Amino acid sequence: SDQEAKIHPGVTCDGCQMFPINGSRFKCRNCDDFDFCETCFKTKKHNTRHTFGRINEPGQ
Ligand SMILES: [Zn+2]
Ligand SMILES: [Zn+2]
C-alpha cells in the first residue's frame, strides 16, 4: 500500500489547487481553512510562525 494513493475527499490544496489532495495532507493550525499537499508543504512560502498538522488519511 502507498501513501500517495490515499485521497482526502473534499480537501483542496491551497498551494496548487490539487483536488482531492492525494498523499499526506498538511492542515494549517493557524489559518481558518488552509491545506497543503506534501509537495506544496515543502516548497511554498507560508507564514513561518504557522504550524501544520500532518493528516495521512481521513479521520486523523
Ligand atoms: Zn499542492
Ligand atoms: Zn497558515
**CA–CA distance, 11 with 52 (Å, rounded to integer):** 15
- The number of domains in the chain is 1
Q: Which ligand is nearest to the CA of 44?
A: 1
Q: Looking up cell 504550524, which residue turns up?
A: 51
CA of 22 to the centre of ligand 2 (A): 20
Q: Resolution in Å, one decimal, please.
A: 2.1
Helix (H, G, I), strand (E, B) or coil at 52: strand
CA of 15 to the centre of ligand 2 (A): 11
Method of determination used here: X-ray
The reply to whether 46 sits in an annotated binding site is: yes
CA of 16 to the centre of ligand 1 (A): 4
Domain extent, residue 60, equals: 1-60
Q: How buried is 49 (Cβ within 10 angstroms: 0-12 exposed, 13-18 middle, 19+ buried)?
A: exposed
Contact between 49 and 32 (Cβ < 8 Å): no
The reply to whether 40 sits in an annotated binding site is: yes
